[PDB]
RNA sequence: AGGCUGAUAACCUA
RNA sequence: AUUCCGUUAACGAACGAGACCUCAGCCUGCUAACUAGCUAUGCGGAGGUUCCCUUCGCGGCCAGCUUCUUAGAGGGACUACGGCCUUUUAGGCCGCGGAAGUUUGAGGCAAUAACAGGUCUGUGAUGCCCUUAGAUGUUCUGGGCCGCACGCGCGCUACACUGAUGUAUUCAACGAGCUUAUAGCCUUGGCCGACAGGCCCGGGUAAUCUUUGAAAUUUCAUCGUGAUGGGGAUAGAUCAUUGCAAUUGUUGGUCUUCAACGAGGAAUUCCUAGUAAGCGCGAGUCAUCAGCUCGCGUUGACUACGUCCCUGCCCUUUGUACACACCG
């Protein structure tokens, strides 16, 4: 069992990937971004808020334990 | 004074709905029923309204007082009291056939809307911590 | 080879097995309703319900 | 002239307690006095649970002992002298009669 | 199970033997007759006797029975 | 419709009224706001920097809904389970200094006063202040 | 002699029937040991229902 | 959210201890002996340091200001009851001892008790429990 | 048929079909068989044999999520998990989540087993019970000590099970159960 | 050393 | 169910079982409540548009009433009714209706004959024996009953994200409570204190006062798979409380310290519905001390509706060299 190494803060390479690739995901959650982008859950939660501010992703469900988001425009 | 007072029971929860001629008000302890807590159980409390429709309640005002029990049991007590109050009101102040129509709808969806659940907590017996559970037995 | 078949329980012969966990039933094939066989069924079963048979060639012996 | 007199009855036997309550209420209706009651307070259940065995050997079995106390309250609107006459009648064994002037 | 004991069966036969005319085929009417013509200490025992006696009355209608002697 | 405290979500009202108290600038926070916990049952101090205003808004709402609550009553209200390491949890009371200080500050603002029967009671000005804030909350 | 305080603890209390200091039932002021109470439970007025 | 700059540090050195730069500043200081979550939280508040940022994001000056608070708790109005060394046996002063200073304090306490052959000191020397616990069944590790 | 009852007031029972003769009468997910607004009913389904077959399939999944011991009796949390899971299923599959759930149950139910050891058939009721048990067991195992939430794990398990893909935990167990049964014929 | 047995042997586990 | 129907060299009875008693589940019907409430009305506060509407407070032994609460008297289920299966039986299966269709649920009580089962350390129950003033009586001081290489049993807390932490929010039941001495019990309210705790004015011998009376859970935020903000053992410093006395920490607080433990081998326990499990509360012990016990409610399932395979029990036939009875 290897230990995961999730970055606590974005780098230029990964941040650009978030702005371009994440908007296209059908399902966007803190854990989905954490696994794909190898980022911590804490950073994913902040990142999702930034995407909401930019309007790149729309909200589907809001709950303290589970947050569900999706692409603002389909395909 | 065309009013009725019907109760609902679930375990130790008792809810009494005061249904009177009105305009459609529905409040629980002075709070609108749209703010029932917990939110996930809000569907259960609204089942009588959803099944019958708001137009059935447009001519009555319901004020509900609930005491005892817990968060889940109070919702069922309120859920049952509302159904009984409307049925009693229609029988006594509207018509018998209209009472027949709404009662069938409530019964078909769920019989607990009008009939209380008789289940209660079984008393604890010595030799264990639960009603049935016994202390762990060791031989050696 | 084995061909999946559907049959409907006709009667409950009785609970069998060492611990009574198996039930022997008489089943009628839906595709051909003139064929009858005995099958051993695990889990609650009652007359009328349908069963899926991976292989229909085997037949359970009475009071197996 | 007319005062609200409170009569409290306590007993372990329900039938004896009910019998005395009926006599007092029925004894006051004869005098056409206003009567409020009887009011039945919740039953007090004294409970003692103890080990059956005088020692500690064997299965731990317990005896649940109950001593139920039933309390009744009757209010009579009349003078103390009239109430004294009604309550002067012989009372059944085990029934405790306590007459006090209600403080209102 | 719901097997009636000797107390229920024995009492029911005796009632029918000497009150066959009064007894009817209705349980609710029969249980009121038992109160009038018998002393049953408990309500639950009275209901069981009334129900079994009503069962015996139905038996008598179709034909004779074993333990009941109707003169 | 005209919304009052009972007609709005408790969560929304406390946030709206907590900002109102901080905005007014009439509450005088104690020197130990940033140091203390809200009871010995807690492990850490509150995370929210404005926890004092939030608690004050919550206490004002409860006094609005029910009169006669004293400091001891508020200790129970904001108490909860205390963990005792390897031993079972049990109920514990919250801080009395936090409750007492908040009540004294709200009384100076004339939101609450001394109930003749004991505890604190909502004043006429307090009812107006709470009701006005609830009416300005956007429907949601 | 008997100088030690006896204001509290098992030593101060004893069964009113037998004088034994163990298993005293202090509830309701019975002040009887569990063995003596069970023997006299019926006479005191306690009854077994369930 | 934000992109880490070149100044971000993954490992910090405070009082001869390795402080992880990827941890929140409040919980990054807990690695220092004598500083817990309660004391780490108050130190950040008295140092006017945002606790919502990671330890690695803090500048050198900001990190130093935290240790000034720990070294002089009374100067920042931290109450005496909040300190892990209250009413010292020798000096009678109130202070927060951390890192090797805390280790030295513990050594002195046990040596003092053993020197006077105190019962608690003797059980420390014998490796037994000192707080009244039953030893018949628990603590079997030898 | 058509009904006005929508699960969670979000999902419609219209168009939901059980395309399996064996388990059609033991799955309650259609508009004709007592649709329910919420999967939380204080029903008495253990009073008699075969009585729990009338319980809604969604609610049966909710009950099986109250494990292990730390989660016993926390049905409000369980209803939330399925409520979130069905929302996730709709996004990923663009299908009715109720239809996906019934498909997962049908595909994940073993049809043969070994007893005593010789191959025996499985009754439709037990087949549904096994499918529900396998689906929740896989979701619970994947969520344990993982960043992924229980609702997300449940959604993926149901999606894979409904699709028949071997990636599902329940599908693998079903194959293993039927593989051993065949060897004991 | 533990488990299994009322107990010992046999057997099983560490 | 030795429960009943029947067979019949037996006929008629006595115990146990059942009946019975307690609690729980139905009653918009009876009795009637200022120590329980509701509805309406009057007045007042606040909001919205003077009326009116929403909400809250207070008052009325001449507003009315008993739905909700309390507790007395009664009613209610009998498998009554339908279908089918059984011998004309006894009875069983399914179903409508019904609060309830498992003897409705759970308890209490509970035969004959037995054990060298436990208790002489419950007893001014007790035979015999021992001791009885350098006492095995009694009391006082101190220590011990807790002592720690180790083995075992009942448990508590955990190994986390279905989570911990910090907010916001919110619903029980069983029960218990004082000598009034300044005051010995349960304690509201006010004030002081970060907490622990302290001071003052009081209520309640109680459906009157404590009691306006829980947690899990719900909700928002933070934490982010890292023995980590999981876990809280071990240990240091210091404060307060009970007591005549706290050291071998009585317990309760504050900061600090931060071990094993990542789901557990052979083996093995309990349990079929408001049950298991989780969650807290009261009571007993009690000056102080609960990880225990006896009850209480709150949240609330999986599986089975069978079998005699294992461990046992009941009855018939049969074998016996056993009767201290196969541990023969
Ligand atoms: K609370
Ligand atoms: K040890
Ligand atoms: K008004
Ligand atoms: K004895
Ligand atoms: K002797
Ligand atoms: K004793
Ligand atoms: K500790
Ligand atoms: Mg540290
Ligand atoms: Mg000790
Ligand atoms: Mg009534
Ligand atoms: Mg009755
Ligand atoms: Mg016997
Ligand atoms: Mg012996
Ligand atoms: Mg000992
Ligand atoms: Mg035990
Ligand atoms: Mg922790
Ligand atoms: Mg409450
Ligand atoms: Mg740690
Ligand atoms: Mg004990
Ligand atoms: Zn005694």
Curated annotation (Swiss-Prot), chain E:
Coiled-coil region(s): none
GO cellular component: ribonucleoprotein complex; ribosome
Any one GO MF annotation of this record: structural constituent of ribosome
BP GO terms, sorted: translation
Keywords, sorted A to Z: Ribonucleoprotein, Ribosomal protein
Keyword Ribosomal protein: yes
Superkingdom field: Eukaryota
Family, per entry: Belongs to the eukaryotic ribosomal protein eS17 family.
Protein name: Small ribosomal subunit protein eS17
Native source species: Solanum lycopersicum
């Amino acid at each position: 069992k290897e230990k995961v190494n999730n970055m606590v803060l974005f780098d230029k390479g990964t941040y650009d990937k978030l702005i371009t690739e994440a908007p296209k995901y059908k399902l966007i959650t803190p854990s989905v971004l954490s696994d794909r982008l190898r980022i911590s859950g804490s950073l994913a939660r902040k990142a999702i808020r930034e995407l909401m501010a930019k309007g790149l992703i729309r909200m589907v469900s809001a709950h303290a334990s589970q947050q569900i988001y999706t692409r603002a425009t389909n395909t | 004074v065309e009013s009725v007072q019907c109760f609902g029971r679930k375990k130790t929860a008792v809810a009494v709905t005061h249904c009177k001629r009105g305009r459609g008000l529905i409040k629980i302890n002075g709070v609108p029923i749209e703010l029932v807590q917990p939110e996930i159980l809000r569907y259960k409390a609204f089942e009588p309204i959803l099944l019958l429709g708001r137009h059935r309640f447009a001519g009555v005002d319901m004020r509900i007082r609930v005491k005892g029990g817990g968060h889940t049991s109070q919702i069922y007590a309120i859920r049952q009291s509302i159904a009984k109050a409307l049925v009693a009101f229609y029988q006594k102040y509207v018509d018998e056939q209209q009472k027949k129509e709404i009662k069938d709808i409530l019964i078909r969806y769920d019989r607990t809307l009008l009939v209380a659940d008789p289940r209660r907590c079984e008393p604890k017996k010595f030799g264990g911590r639960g009603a049935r559970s016994r202390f762990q037995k060791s031989y050696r | 080879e084995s061909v999946t078949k559907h049959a409907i329980v006709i009667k409950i012969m009785g609970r069998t097995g060492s611990r009574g966990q198996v039930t022997q039933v008489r089943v009628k094939f839906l595709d051909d309703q003139n064929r009858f066989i005995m099958r051993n069924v695990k889990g609650p079963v009652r007359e009328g319900d349908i069963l899926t048979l991976l292989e229909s060639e085997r037949e359970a012996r009475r009071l197996r | 002239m007319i005062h609200k007199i409170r009569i409290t009855l306590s007993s372990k036997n329900v039938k004896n307690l009910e019998k005395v309550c009926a006599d007092l209420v029925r004894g006051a209706k004869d005098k056409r006095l206003r009567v409020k009651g009887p009011v039945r307070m919740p039953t007090k259940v004294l409970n003692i649970t103890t080990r059956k065995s005088p020692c500690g050997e064997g299965t731990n079995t317990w005896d649940r002992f109950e001593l139920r106390v039933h309390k009744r309250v009757i209010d009579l609107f009349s003078s103390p002298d009239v109430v004294k006459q009604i309550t002067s009648i012989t009372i059944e064994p085990g029934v405790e009669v306590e007459v006090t002037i209600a403080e209102s | 199970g719901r097997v009636r004991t000797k107390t229920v069966k024995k009492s029911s036969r005796q009632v029918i033997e000497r009150y066959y005319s009064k007894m009817t085929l209705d349980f609710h009417t029969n249980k009121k007759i038992l109160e009038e013509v018998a002393i049953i200490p408990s309500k639950r025992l009275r209901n069981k006797i009334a129900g079994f006696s009503t069962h015996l009355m139905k038996r008598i209608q179709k034909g004779p029975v074993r333990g009941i002697s109707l003169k | 419709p005209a919304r009052s405290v009972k007609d709005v979500s408790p969560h929304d009202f406390v946030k709206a009224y907590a900002a109102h108290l901080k905005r007014s600038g009439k509450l005088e926070l104690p020197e130990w706001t940033d140091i203390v916990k809200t009871g010995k049952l807690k492990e850490l101090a509150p995370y929210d920097p404005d926890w004092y205003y939030i608690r004050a808004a919550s206490m004002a709402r409860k006094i609005y809904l029910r009169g006669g609550i004293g400091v001891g009553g508020f200790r129970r209200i904001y108490g909860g389970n205390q963990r005792n390491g390897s031993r079972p949890r049990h109920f514990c009371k919250s801080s009395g200094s936090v409750a007492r200080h908040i009540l004294q500050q709200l009384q100076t603002m004339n939101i609450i006063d001394f109930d003749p029967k004991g505890g604190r009671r909502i004043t006429s000005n307090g009812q107006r202040d709470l009701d006005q804030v609830a009416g300005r909350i956007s429907a949601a | 002699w008997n100088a030690h305080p006896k204001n509290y603890g098992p030593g101060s209390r004893t069964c009113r029937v037998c004088g034994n200091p163990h298993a005293i039932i202090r509830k309701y002021g019975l002040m009887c040991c569990r063995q003596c109470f069970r023997s006299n439970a019926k006479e005191i007025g306690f009854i077994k229902y369930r | 959210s934000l992109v880490a700059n070149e100044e971000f540090q993954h490992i910090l050195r405070v009082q001869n201890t390795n402080v992880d730069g990827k941890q929140k500043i409040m919980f990054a200081l807990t690695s220092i002996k004598g500083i817990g979550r309660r004391f780490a939280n108050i130190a950040c508040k008295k140092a006017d340091i945002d606790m919502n940022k990671r330890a690695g994001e803090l500048t050198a000056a900001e990190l130093d200001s935290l240790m000034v608070v720990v070294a002089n708790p009374r100067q920042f109005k931290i109450p005496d009851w909040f300190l892990n060394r209250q009413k010292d046996y020798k000096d009678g002063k109130f202070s927060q001892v951390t890192s090797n200073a805390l280790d030295m304090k513990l050594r002195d306490d046990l040596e003092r008790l053993k020197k006077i052959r105190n019962h608690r000191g003797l059980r420390h020397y014998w490796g037994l429990r000192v707080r009244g616990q039953h030893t018949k069944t628990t603590g079997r590790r030898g | 048929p058509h009904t006005d009852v929508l699960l969670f007031n979000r999902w419609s029972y219209d168009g939901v079909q059980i395309a399996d003769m064996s388990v059609e009468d033991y799955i309650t997910a259609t508009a004709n068989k007592h649709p329910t607004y919420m999967p939380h009913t204080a029903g008495r389904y253990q009073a008699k044999r075969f009585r729990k077959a009338q319980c809604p399939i969604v609610e049966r999944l909710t009950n099986s999520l109250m494990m292990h011991g730390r989660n016993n009796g926390k049905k409000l949390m369980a209803v939330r998990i399925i409520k979130h899971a069905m929302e996730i299923i709709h996004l990923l599959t663009d299908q009715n989540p109720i239809q996906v759930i019934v498909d997962a149950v049908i595909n994940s139910g073993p049809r043969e087993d070994a007893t005593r050891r010789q191959a025996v058939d499985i009754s439709p009721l037990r087949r549904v019970n096994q499918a529900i048990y396998l689906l929740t067991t896989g979701a619970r195992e994947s969520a344990f000590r993982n960043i992924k939430t229980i609702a997300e794990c449940l959604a993926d398990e149901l999606i894979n099970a409904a699709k028949g893909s071997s990636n599902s935990y329940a599908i693998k167990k079903k194959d293993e159960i039927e593989r051993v049964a065949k060897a004991n014929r």
